Amino acid sequence: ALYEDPPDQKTSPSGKPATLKICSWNVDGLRAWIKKKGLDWVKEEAPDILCLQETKCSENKLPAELQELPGLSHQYWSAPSDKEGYSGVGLLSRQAPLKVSYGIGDEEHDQEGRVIVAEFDSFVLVTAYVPNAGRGLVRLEYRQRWDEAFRKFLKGLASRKPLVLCGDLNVAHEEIDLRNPKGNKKNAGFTPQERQGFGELLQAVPLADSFRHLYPNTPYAYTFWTYMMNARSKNVGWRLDYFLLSHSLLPALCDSKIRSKALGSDHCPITLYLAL
DNA sequence: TCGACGGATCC
DNA sequence: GCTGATGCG
DNA sequence: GGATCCGTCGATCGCATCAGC
Ligand SMILES: [Ca+2]
Ligand code: NA
DSSP states (O other): OOOOOOOOOOOOOOOOOEEEEEEEEEEHHHHHHHTTTTTHHHHHHHHEEEEEEEEOOOOGOOOOOGOOOOGEEEEEEEOOOOOOSSOOEEESSSSSOOOEEEOOGGGOOOOOOEEEEESSSSOEEEEEEOOOOOOTTEEEEEEEHHHHHHHHHHHHHHOOOOOOOOOOOOOOSSSGGSOSSGGGGGTTTTHHHHHHHHHHHHHTTTEEEEHHHHTTTSSSSBBBBTTTGGGGHHOOOBOOOOEEGGGGGGEHHHHHHHOOOSSSSSSSOOEEEEEO
């Protein structure tokens, strides 16, 4: 079935207006996404922080259009060291964060340009591009090593300040989070080991799944559709991109959106509203 | 993701 | 410069 | 014993890069 995201809810459950709009988006090749007019959409959506994943672009090749974003003038990039046109993430913010770091404090996992951390007054924001488990699960062993290291690291962070984690976490948590759960139980993104890892990340830090806190019963809500087999037009997709929130930010949560119509990638954008 | 193929399983 | 592969999703 | 379910397989799209010439 198809799915219509409901209108933006911009008031907290205590009547306070939203003061921060975070937009996350796996662009799957920054340079191609630019040509497919993805920055035009970002300009209209006008967020305070933009998080992009799977950038496939070294910083010395960063397109010139990124210099035409006045409301997003503070930009931070993490490329891999060895591989080219592979992974890479970006974090752009209207105001300058207090401190910016890269990776998760573990040498084995900081080589691929997947994590950026920005600290603000009231919270720390982590944007993430979690390693896919791979065709034939030939990275699933590494991904469990990732999940373990990443979970610990985030718990350390969330114990200091309220944490927002956004990005492509490369797993559909429950059956409701993808269109064909029955047939994907041994494919990357829906194995038992990645599903449990996600549940463990939720229960251990702890963190809530913003979208599921607000619409626990809503199915057919996805952020990725394969380019093949005309999946996007049949809404045969996966929910892979998340805003994960500290429980102490839930009183501040106004809405968590899935921007289904915005093209440019095999992922769509998600955006978070918070009253801070 | 989807189709085509053989090989169970079902009342 | 073209064409069609590869690695990775 | 006609139908339906089952688990493999292969190919499919796109980006960025490379091989070859
Ligand atoms: Ca020749
Ligand atoms: Na290559």
